[PDB]
């Protein structure tokens, strides 16, 4: 038998010996083994927490904010345009294990409408977004000799 974590472990070895604990206990602790299914990726491990604890850790499992990942999705995190702008070449080279997993970017729009009172801050944004821009706008070339 293989079990959950340290605390889980301790407890068992502990009670196992407090003589006054139903012969059923030893049994259960005993023969009860983990669950290891290679294919699929299933792992049902025997555990022990507490009502309020299971409560926690549980939801942490049922909310593993981790979606899959196909060459296709990578391709897609890309503006509908550009791909349709011949001037630019696209291609794949690395493969993708059915192990792939990413974290949603969460891009819900404005949510907060500051663009209608918080001038002070917009100015600071614009400024920012602006410098940002200059950093990108490619430099020019082949000009006409100043002189």
């Amino acid at each position: 038998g293989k079990v959950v974590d340290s605390e889980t472990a301790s407890i068992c070895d502990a009670i196992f010996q407090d003589e006054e604990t139903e012969g059923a206990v030893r049994r259960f602790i005993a023969e009860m083994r983990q669950r290891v299914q290679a294919d699929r990726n299933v792992v049902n491990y025997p555990s022990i927490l507490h009502p309020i604890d299971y409560a926690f850790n549980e939801y942490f499992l049922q909310h593993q904010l981790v979606e899959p990942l196909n060459n296709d999705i990578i391709f897609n995190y890309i503006p509908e345009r550009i791909r349709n702008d011949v001037n630019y070449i696209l291609n794949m080279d690395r493969n993708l294990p059915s192990t792939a997993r990413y974290i949603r970017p969460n891009l819900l729009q404005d949510r907060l409408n500051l663009h209608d009172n918080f001038e002070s801050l917009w100015d600071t944004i614009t400024t920012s977004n602006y410098i940002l821009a200059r950093s990108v706008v490619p430099d020019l070339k082949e000009l006409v000799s100043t002189e």
Partner: protein
């Protein structure tokens, strides 16, 4: 075959011993056995039907094992299991039924269906277990050249036969002497009549006899024997032996005299009872012989004397009779009886699916016809077919 059996006690001792609650180790020795099965299966494909109105269903396997854990079985454990059993249930049904129809002459005792012919395969034997179901217990012992039968009831050994034999008759049928009877199931009623009331008979006694030959030996039979044949104690108008006319029977009943019942085996008397009415034991026999007499009453009150004149017309017909019923018995061959549903199950499945008459069984699995000509082939097929019906009834009734 034996394979088949397990598949069930597996499920019963399953759909029964597995319920929201029970502690862990009450199913350890069980769970195991179960899984073992699943494995052997998954991968192998099956087919049933293709005969009469029998749905040709296709079956596949690919089911997970278990979460051989949790102490006091949590509800969630059950449901994820029942859903996997209900495929085996609805399966086996379609399996039994498929091999519960095919008949084979030469060697009919063996498996027939494309479903079962694959089960007797070797890679499957990894399953057999708990053969305490009376029928399998007996199937095995039979493949081992050995003796042992089944416990029956108000058994069905006598093919229906209702007739008479006139030992003395004449065209007018006004002074007959003979016997009439009804042999059916586990019962025999026979009456001996003498219109003349033995007026000219030696010692004023007319002897009667009724012999019934069983198609199979019955052992350890508990039998009720009673004087009188109520069935032949009332006025009747009967067809003549040649069917050309009808005669009148107007019985008056007297006690059967010198009653002797013999239960014989191969011509030898095994049990004999002289005038013993009530419960008697016949331990091993293939023939029953009932002998009884009508003795003209030596002393008669006027009312009685008036019924029996010295000369014709004979208007009151002296009759003596016996009734014999086999309450229970053991037979080395399968038979229909008053309690088991085997015959009815086999007959019912065949009727429901419009199964065509085959080369072995009489049309409609007719019992009288079957027992009348109970050939080795019919018996081997009947046993195979009865054993399957019993396997099916463990899950589907």
């Amino acid at each position: 075959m034996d394979v088949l059996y397990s598949l069930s006690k597996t499920l019963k001792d399953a759909r029964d011993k597995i319920v929201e609650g029970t502690l862990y180790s009450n199913v350890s020795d069980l769970i195991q056995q179960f899984n073992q099965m699943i494995i052997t299966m998954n991968g192998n494909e099956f087919q049933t039907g293709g005969i009469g109105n029998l749905p040709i269903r296709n079956w596949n396997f690919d089911f997970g094992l278990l979460g051989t854990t949790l102490l006091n079985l949590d509800a969630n454990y059950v449901e994820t299991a029942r859903n996997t059993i209900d495929y085996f249930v609805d399966f086996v049904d379609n399996v039994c039924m498929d091999e519960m129809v095919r008949e084979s002459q030469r060697n009919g005792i063996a498996p027939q269906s494309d479903s079962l012919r694959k089960l007797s395969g070797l890679k499957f034997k990894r399953i057999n277990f708990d053969n305490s179901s009376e029928y399998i217990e007996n199937w095995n012992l039979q493949n081992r050249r050995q003796r042992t039968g089944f416990t029956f009831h108000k058994p069905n050994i006598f093919p229906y036969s209702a007739s008479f034999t006139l030992n003395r008759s004449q065209p007018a049928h006004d002074n007959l002497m003979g016997t009439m009877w009804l042999n059916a199931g586990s019962e025999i009623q026979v009456a001996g009549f003498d219109y003349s009331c033995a007026i000219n008979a030696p010692a004023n006694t007319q002897q009667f006899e009724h012999i019934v030959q069983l198609r199979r030996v019955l052992t350890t039979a508990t039998i009720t024997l009673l004087p009188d044949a109520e069935r032949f104690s009332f006025p009747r108008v009967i067809n003549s032996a040649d069917g050309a006319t009808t005669w009148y029977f107007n019985p008056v009943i007297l006690r059967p005299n010198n009653v002797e019942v013999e239960f014989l085996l191969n011509g030898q008397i095994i049990n004999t009872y002289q005038a013993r009415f009530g419960t008697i034991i016949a331990r091993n026999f293939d023939t029953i012989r009932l002998s009884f007499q009508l003795m003209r009453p030596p002393n008669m009150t006027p009312a009685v004397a008036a019924l029996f004149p010295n000369a014709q017309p004979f208007e009151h017909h002296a009759t003596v009779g016996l009734t014999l019923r086999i309450e229970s018995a053991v037979c080395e061959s399968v038979l229909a009886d008053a309690s088991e549903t085997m015959l009815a199950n086999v007959t019912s499945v065949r009727q429901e699916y419009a199964i065509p008459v085959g080369p072995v069984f009489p049309p409609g699995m007719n019992w009288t016809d079957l027992i009348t000509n109970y050939s080795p082939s019919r018996e081997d097929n009947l046993q195979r077919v009865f054993t399957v019906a019993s396997i099916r009834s463990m899950l589907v009734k």
